Amino acid sequence: MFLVDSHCHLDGLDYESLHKDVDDVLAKAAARDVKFCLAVATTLPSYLHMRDLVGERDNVVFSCGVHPLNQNDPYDVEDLRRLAAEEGVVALGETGLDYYYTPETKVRQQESFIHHIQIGRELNKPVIVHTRDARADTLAILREEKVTDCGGVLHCFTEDRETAGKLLDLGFYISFSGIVTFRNAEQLRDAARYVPLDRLLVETDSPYLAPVPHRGKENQPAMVRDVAEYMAVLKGVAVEELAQVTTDNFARLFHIDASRLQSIR
Ligand SMILES: [Zn+2]
Ligand SMILES: [Zn+2]
C-alpha cells in the first residue's frame, strides 16, 4: 500500500520529545505505509526555513505561499513568484481565506489569495486552499480568477456537500483530515460520501487534528493511515483501493511522475 499525507506542517512538529528529527517522522510514516508527504509553509520566511530543515528528500514535496491567517506583515509578491519556481515546490499556498479570527484583514487576505492563484496559473502549479467561515468569498475568487487554469485542492475540507459540489465543478480535489472522525463531524462524513473517489485526497494537517483513535495527541503524518482507513470505511472500499486512487489523484493534481509514487525497486 502507498499512502500520501497531502498536507502536513513538518516545521511544526515536536522534535523535542515526540520525534528525534525529520528522518524519524518519515520512518514512522513509512511503517504505516505513508510514504510521501507534501510539506506546507505558512509564510515566505518559514518556507526558507522549511527547505533547510527538511533538505533534499525523495519522498517530500513542498508548497510555497502565505497562509490566510498570516496577513498582517506585508510581503512581496515578487518573492512569492521567485520562490514558488524552486524545484521541490509543487503548489502555491496554503492560501485561501479564514474569517474565523476576522480582525478585518479580509481585504488583504483576498488580495493575497488572488496573487497565489495568478502565480499558480503562471507556473502551472496548483493552489492548496484553506477556507473557514468564508464560503461565498472563496468560490467567488476561485471562479473569477480562473483557478481552473492551474487546478487545486480544498485542503482539510470542513464545509458541506453542496459546497464540495461547487468546488468539484471547478475541477478541484477535496482532501479530508482527521476532523472527519470527530463526533460532531456528520456534515463532513456526508461530504466524504459524496466526493467521487477520483477527486479525493487525505491528509493530517499535522500537528493539528489528530484522528480517532488518537485524539488528544499531537498529529503526525503516519496518522494519515487512520484517516485513510476511516475514509475507506465510509466510502465502502478497501483501504488499499483508497490508498491507490488518492495517490493517483495526488500525482495528477501536483504533476508528480508516478514512479516517485511507487515502492518497486
Ligand atoms: Zn489550512
Ligand atoms: Zn495547513
Ligand 2 centroid to residue 53 C-alpha, Å: 18
Q: Report the C-alpha gap between 145 and 135 in whole angstroms.
A: 16
Residue 130 CA, ligand 2 centroid: distance in Å: 7
CA atoms within 13 A on the CB side of 119: 30
Q: Is 7 annotated as a binding residue?
A: yes
Within a 10 A sphere around the Cβ of 51, how many other Cβ atoms? 18
Number of neighbouring beta carbons within 10 Å of residue 55: 10
205 is in an annotated binding site: yes
Any residues with CB less than 8 A from the CB of 174 and at least 6 apart, and which?
Answer: 153, 154, 157, 164, 167, 168, 191, 195, 199, 200, 201
For the chain, the domains span 1-265
Q: CA-CA distance, 178 to 176, in Å (whole number)?
A: 7
- The answer to whether 155 is a known ligand-binding residue is yes
If you ran DSSP here, which 8-state letter would residue 221 be given?
G
State in Å: Cα 265 to ligand 2 middle: 32
255 is in an annotated binding site: no
Sequence-ordered alpha helix ranges (H) in 145-238: 161-168, 186-194, 224-235
Give the ligand whose atoms come closest to the C-alpha of residue 7.
Answer: 2
Q: Check whether 130 is labelled as a binding-site residue.
A: yes
Nearest listed ligand to the Cα of residue 8:
2
Contact (CB, 8 A) for 151 and 253: yes
**The CA-based dihedral angle spanning residues 20, 179, 225, 243, taken in that order and rounded to the nearest 10 degrees:** -140
Ligand nearest to the CA of 10: 2
User: Which residues fall inside 5 Å of ion ligand 1, going by CB?
Assistant: 94, 130
Q: Which fold has domain 1-265?
A: TIM Barrel (3.20.20)
Closest CA to 178 of 5, 2, 3, 61: 5
Q: Which residue has the cell 515526540?
A: 18
115 annotated ligand binder: no
User: By the 8 A CB rule, do 48 and 75 touch?
Assistant: no
Cβ count within 10 A of residue 56: 8
**Distance from Cα 53 to the centre of ligand 1, integer Å:** 21
Q: How far is the CA of 191 from the centre of ligand 1 (A)?
A: 18
Identify any residues that bridge with 130 across adjacent strands, giving them in sequence order.
96
Instruction: Return d(Cα 98, Cα 162) in angstroms, integer.
Output: 19
Q: What resolution in angstrom units was achieved for this structure?
A: 1.9
Task: Output the CA–CA distances (angstroms, integers) from residue 226 to 34, 96, 241, 243, in the order listed.
Answer: 10, 26, 14, 11
Region label for 254, one of left (φ > 0), alpha (ψ between -120 and 50) or beta (otherwise): alpha
CA–centroid distance, 130 to ligand 1, in Å, is 4
Q: Is the peptide bond before 94 cis (omega within 30 degrees of 0)?
A: yes
